[PDB]
Design a binder for these strands. Structure first.
Lengths: 49, 97, 195, 147
RNA sequence: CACCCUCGA
DNA sequence: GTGTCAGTAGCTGTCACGGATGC
DNA sequence: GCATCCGTGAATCGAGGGTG
C-alpha cells in the first residue's frame, strides 16, 4: 500500500495496525494483512533484538 | 591465522613491485582471499585450514558459536564468586526453611 | 588487493549473489580466479563500429576456409599420385587400401584443425556481439582473444576487485524499484525470488 | 614488440599447469600442511620465473630442479623455529588500610604525598622534610594499627 | 587454555 | 646455491529438516 | 518449474589425569 513494509515480510500485528493507523489517517492506502503461523524456532529469530 | 594472512599479503606486495607474471599475482590474490576467509570463518568454504594433527583451526566466528561460544558460555551464564558445592545428606530434624 | 567477506558470499543465501543477481557458483568462480567478469562495455562505440568488425571477422573466416581447401587439395593430389606410384611398383591392393585410409585420415585431421579454428572465431564473434556486464568467461584463451581483438570496447577483470567494481557501477534505487515492479505483478514462481 | 612480454606469461602458465599441482604434493607430504605447501609453491615458482637459466633447456628436467628449491625452503623454516589473573584481595586490603591512615594526616602532608617542588611552590628541603615527617606519621599510624 | 581420556548425579 | 625417477592421509559407521542452489 | 544438496541444530552441573 503506502507503507514501507516489504511485501512478504512477517511483521508483528501491533506495528502493522499502528502503521496502518497512521497511513489510514494520512490518506495513503493501508498495508494489507493476512494472519501467519510461525514455529517457535522461527518466531524466536524474528524478534526485534 | 593472522600470521598466514600477513605472509601472503606481504608476498602480494613483493609480487606487485617485482612485476611478476599475471598468473602468479592472480593465483596469489586467490590465496589471500582464502586466508582472509579462514581468518573470519575457517571451514565455511571447502576444506578447513588444518593445524598440527589434522585439527581444524578455530576462527573468529568459531568464538561465538554453540555452547563454547562467547554468547552461551560467557554471557548467558557466568561463573560466580561466593559459591561452593558439596555432597548432600538427608536431615530429618531440619525445618523446611 | 581487495578481498571479500566470506560471511556475505558463502553464507546462505549468498548476499552478494542476491545483490548483483549473480549465481553463487558464478560468483565463486569470479572471486577465486576461475572466470573473468565483464565490468563495463562501451556499447555505443561497438554499435558505431559493428559493420567494420563484422566484415573483418568474415574475411578472417574466409581466409581459414580458403587455406583449408588449398591444403586439402595438395593432400588429395599427393594421395592419387602416391596410389598410382605404388601401383607402378606392383604392391598388393591391400597396401594401397592402407595408404588410402591414411590419406583420408590426414585430410580429416586438416579439416578438423580448420573446423576448430572456425568454431573459435564463431564463438569469439558471438560473445562480442552479445556482450553485457556481469557475464562470465570461463575459457581463459577466449578472454585473452577478446582483449587482444576488441579490448578497446569493453573492460573486464577478475577476483574480488572486479566485484568491488561491479558494486560501484550499481544503481541501488533503480534495481529496488525494478524488483518492486516485478513484485506488484508477477508469478509466485518468479515472485519469491524477487521478494 | 609486445608479443614477447606476452610470451613470458604464456611460458609460465605453461609450466604451472604441468608442475604446480605436483610440487604442491611434495611440500604437502613434507609439511603435512596444505596451507604452507600452498605458500611454498608460489615462493618456488616465483624463484623459477626469476631464474630463467633453468627452464631454457626444455629438454632438461625442471621438476627435478623445483623439488630441491622447496625441500630447502621448508627446512629453512625448520631451523631453530622451535594464565588467569589473581584476586586483588591483598593489594586492596593494603590500600584500604593506607586509605585509613590517610585521614590521620594534615591536608598539606596529604597534597604532598599524593604527588614535585615546582608546583606546590615551596623548597626542595620543605619537600624532603614534609615527605620525611609525613612518611614517619604514616609508618607510625600503620604500626599503631599493628601492620 | 586448545584439544583428549576416564568418571559422578 | 639448488637441477636424471623424484608426487596427501584419511576417510562415511549420525540424523531430521527447511530452503537456497542448481539441472 | 522441481529435485539436489547445503547448512542449521541436537540437556545441565561436577571430578581427576595427559599432552601440543
Amino acid at each position: 500500500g503506502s507503507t514501507e513494509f516489504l511485501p512478504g515480510s512477517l511483521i508483528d500485528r501491533a506495528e502493522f495496525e499502528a502503521e496502518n493507523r497512521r497511513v489510514v489517517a494520512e490518506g495513503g492506502e493501508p498495508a494489507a494483512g493476512r494472519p501467519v503461523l510461525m514455529g517457535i524456532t522461527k518466531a524466536s529469530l524474528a524478534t526485534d533484538s | 591465522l593472522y600470521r598466514r594472512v600477513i605472509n601472503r599479503n606481504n608476498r602480494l606486495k613483493r609480487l606487485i613491485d617485482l612485476g611478476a607474471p599475471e598468473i602468479i599475482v592472480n593465483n596469489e590474490k586467490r590465496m589471500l582471499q582464502e586466508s582472509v576467509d579462514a581468518l573470519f570463518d575457517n571451514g565455511r568454504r571447502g576444506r578447513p585450514v588444518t593445524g598440527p594433527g589434522n585439527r581444524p583451526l578455530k576462527s573468529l566466528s568459531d568464538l561465538l558459536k554453540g555452547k563454547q561460544g562467547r554468547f552461551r558460555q560467557n554471557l548467558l551464564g557466568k561463573r560466580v564468586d561466593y559459591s561452593g558445592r558439596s555432597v548432600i545428606v538427608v536431615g530429618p530434624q531440619l525445618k523446611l526453611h | 588487493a581487495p578481498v571479500t567477506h566470506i560471511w556475505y558470499f558463502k553464507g546462505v543465501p549468498s548476499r552478494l549473489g542476491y545483490l548483483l543477481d549473480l549465481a553463487p557458483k558464478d560468483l565463486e568462480k569470479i572471486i577465486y580466479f576461475a572466470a573473468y567478469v565483464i565490468t563495463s562495455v562501451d556499447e555505443e562505440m561497438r554499435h558505431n563500429e559493428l559493420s567494420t568488425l563484422e566484415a573483418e571477422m568474415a574475411v578472417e573466416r574466409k581466409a581459414v576456409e580458403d587455406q583449408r581447401d588449398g591444403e586439402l587439395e595438395a593432400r588429395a593430389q599427393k594421395l592419387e599420385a602416391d596410389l598410382a606410384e605404388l601401383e607402378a611398383e606392383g604392391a598388393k591392393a591391400d597396401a594401397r587400401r592402407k595408404v588410402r585410409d591414411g590419406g583420408e585420415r590426414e585430410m580429416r585431421q586438416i579439416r578438423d584443425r580448420a573446423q576448430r579454428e572456425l568454431d573459435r572465431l564463431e564463438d569469439i564473434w558471438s560473445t562480442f556481439t552479445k556482450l553485457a556486464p556481469k557475464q562470465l568467461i570461463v575459457d581463459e584463451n577466449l578472454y585473452r582473444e577478446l582483449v587482444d581483438r576488441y579490448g578497446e570496447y569493453f573492460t573486464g577483470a577478475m577476483g574480488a576487485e572486479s566485484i568491488q567494481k561491479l558494486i560501484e557501477n550499481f544503481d541501488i534505487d533503480a534495481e529496488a524499484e525494478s524488483l518492486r515492479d516485478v513484485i506488484r505483478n508477477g508469478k509466485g514462481q518468479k515472485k519469491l525470488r524477487a521478494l | 614488440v609486445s608479443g614477447a612480454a606476452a610470451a613470458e606469461a604464456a611460458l609460465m602458465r605453461a609450466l604451472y599447469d604441468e608442475h604446480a599441482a605436483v610440487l604442491w604434493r611434495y611440500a604437502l607430504r613434507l609439511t603435512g600442511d596444505a596451507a604452507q605447501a600452498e605458500d611454498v609453491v608460489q615462493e618456488t615458482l616465483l624463484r623459477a620465473w626469476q631464474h630463467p637459466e633453468v627452464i631454457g633447456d626444455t629438454a632438461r628436467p625442471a621438476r627435478a630442479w623445483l623439488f630441491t628449491v622447496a625441500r630447502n625452503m621448508i627446512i629453512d623454516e625448520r631451523r631453530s623455529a622451535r594464565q588467569s589473573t589473581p584476586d586483588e584481595v591483598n593489594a586492596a586490603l593494603d590500600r584500604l588500610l593506607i586509605a585509613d591512615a590517610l585521614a590521620q594526616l594534615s591536608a598539606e602532608h596529604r597534597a604532598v604525598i599524593q604527588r614535585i617542588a615546582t608546583d606546590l611552590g615551596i623548597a626542595e628541603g620543605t619537600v624532603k622534610s614534609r615527605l620525611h615527617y609525613a612518611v614517619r606519621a604514616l609508618r607510625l599510624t600503620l604500626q599503631e594499627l599493628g601492620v
